[PDB]
Each structure stands twice: as C-alpha cells, then as structure tokens.
Automatic annotation (TrEMBL), chains A, B:
One of its GO terms (molecular function) is DNA binding. Signal peptide: none annotated. It comes from Streptococcus thermophilus (strain ATCC BAA-250 / LMG 18311). This is Positive transcriptional regulator MutR family. It comes from the Bacteria.
Amino acid sequence: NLVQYIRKQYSLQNINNIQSLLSTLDPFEKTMVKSILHTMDSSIIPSDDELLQLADYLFKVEKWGYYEIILLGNCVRTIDYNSVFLLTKEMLNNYIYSSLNKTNKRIVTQLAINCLILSIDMEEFTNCFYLIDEIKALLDNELNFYEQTVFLYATGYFEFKRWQSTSGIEKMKQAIQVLDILGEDNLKLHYTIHFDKLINNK
Amino acid sequence: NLVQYIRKQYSLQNINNIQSLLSTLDPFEKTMVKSILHTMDSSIIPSDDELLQLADYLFKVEKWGYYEIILLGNCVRTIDYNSVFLLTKEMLNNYIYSSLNKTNKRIVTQLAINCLILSIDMEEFTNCFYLIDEIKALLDNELNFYEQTVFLYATGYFEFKRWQSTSGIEKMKQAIQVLDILGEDNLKLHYTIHFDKLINNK
C-alpha cells in the first residue's frame, strides 16, 4: 500500500493503471508519481511549479526519513540537477537511521549511486568525486552487495566517460558479470546495453 | 549495544573481552555468547542443559522476532542438529516481517542458508532439498545479493558433496568470483579454502 502498487504496476509496465491516481495521495506523492511515468510515457511531465514545491519542502526538511528519501529518489531525474545534488548532499548528512533498521541506509545508498550516475551523465565530475567517497563510506563494513555491484559499474562509467580508460571498461564488465552469475538477467541486460552504447559511440 | 559489542569484538578476535560477560544479559543471551566463543576457543562449550533450555524456549515461541532469530542463528552449530532444523523450519513459517522493515527477512535468509551449509555437512540431503526451495522463495524478487552469493556457493557445495558434479564446482567458483569482484577479500579467502578442501580431499 505504501509504495507497493507503485512498483507492482511498474513490474507489469501498466502505465494507465497508476496514471489512474491523478484524480490516497498528497501533492508531493502526486509529483513523485508523475515523474515515474515520465520514464514510461516520455510526455507525462511534472512541470516546474510542482517540482520546485517538493524541492523546496526537501530543502527545509531537518531530518530525512523514509518519506523524504523515497520522494527525492523517485524524482532525481525531473527535479533540476543542481537541487537534486544539494538535496542528495543534505540527505546523506541528515537521514534517520540506527542499527536495527538499516533500511534507510540502503535506499540512501541507492539514491546516492543513482545521483552519481546522473552526475556522470551531466559531466559533473567534481560532484562525482564527492559522491564516490560518500558511497564508499555507506558501503564500507556493510554487506550491501547489490549497491556494491551498481556502484562498481558507476565507478567504471565515471572512469570511462572521463578517460576512456581500460580500467573503467573492466569495472563495468565485472559488475555485469556479477549480475550474470546471480541470475539477474533483466539488470544484466539493461547494464549490458548501457555498456554497449558507451563503447559503440565514440 | 544490542549485539554490536558482540560482532565489534568479533572483528578484533578478542576472545577474553566478551568472554568477560559470563559474570546486561539473560541466560539465553549467555548461551548465545558461549556458543560464539566455541568458534574462537574450541573448548568453551555450552553444555546441553543450557542449550536444551533455549531450544525448548524457541520451540514454544509463537512469533519469531529479532530476539529469537539472533538467538537461534548464533547457536545453529551447538544446539543439536535435529532441533536446529525443526526450529529453522518453524522460524521460516512464523518470523515477523512487513514491507518497510525487511531486516527480519534478511537474517532469516542468512540463517536458513547457514543451516543449509550445516545440513550439507551432516549429509541431510532430504533437509537440503527443503531448505533450497525455502531460500529461493526468500530471495526471489528481492535484491539480497550477499545471500544470493552465499546461497549459490551452498548450492554448489550441495551438488558437489552429493555427486562431485562439474556443475557444483562451477557454482562454487562463480560465488567466489562475485566476492573477488566486489573486493570482499576475507570472505573470498575463507570460501576459497573451503573450496580447496572439498576438491583436495577425495
């Protein structure tokens, strides 16, 4: 109920089914939804005013809980990048977590990695350096192998787009191999095509 | 405080430091501690009476929370196997979890896998078949890559000890490769030596 019907229908790729929830929610959950459909139907756009309002809310949030983290993470590619990076930078320093429930640590790590991928896309390499050290501390002495695999690919992506280095190639191919070994075919194929485009477009 | 000083001192291998807590606790946390030191000092043995009392408590536990799961998991190799398997079988069917906090799902999965490794050790192959299907359901449509890697090695271990099959060899070597790729050197080396003994002793 929380966000289950979100990703449940995202599994089936039924656009018109949670598009049905434009008319329950709040305005922030309404924009979080709209930016998700921007990935499905590339013309369902949350325009700036509803994005600037959620971004302003997150800017004055003092403590980041599950509510704020899921809201930001779902709109990392619709809120303007300059705000997303600052909000990510603030979420990293103010997310609520103790040692029983580390669920907030996971999705914060997944968010920081997704923002790192976006930072590589925008060629914000100074911001990539910051996020790389923040993610390594989130992963260190933890057993978050999924985030470690995505972070390894993102590290190779950063090293490739910046230098076309052989080392960045190997990191990306090693992360794909982890997904291959663990039977994660859908993730492996999406990361393979992303890798194919990188080398086959230069 | 909960179990931090347990694994914190376990990182430093300081035996005499949480051995200091035999004289805070309850009798169940006292036996959970004692069986942990049985891995360090192989003569610090929790004798049967304190093990049968915790095992009896877990047998009548109606709902398995973080308390019961951590108690069983730390004594899977000191409580008699016949009880450990039945308790694992009951924990799988009665562990408390909802969709925000899936921490109980993780350590239940890690427990079931550790009991699977012990079941392979005891040549309880009928019990291995049961645990394999239970772990696959716990992992399915989840992103628990660490448990997936350990479960893959355990699957290859089961297939090797039962048939010395080439397929079991590959699964174990692939799980070691995941640990190698993700920089998990300590886990990779422990799993490598375990793998070395399997093939170099037949």
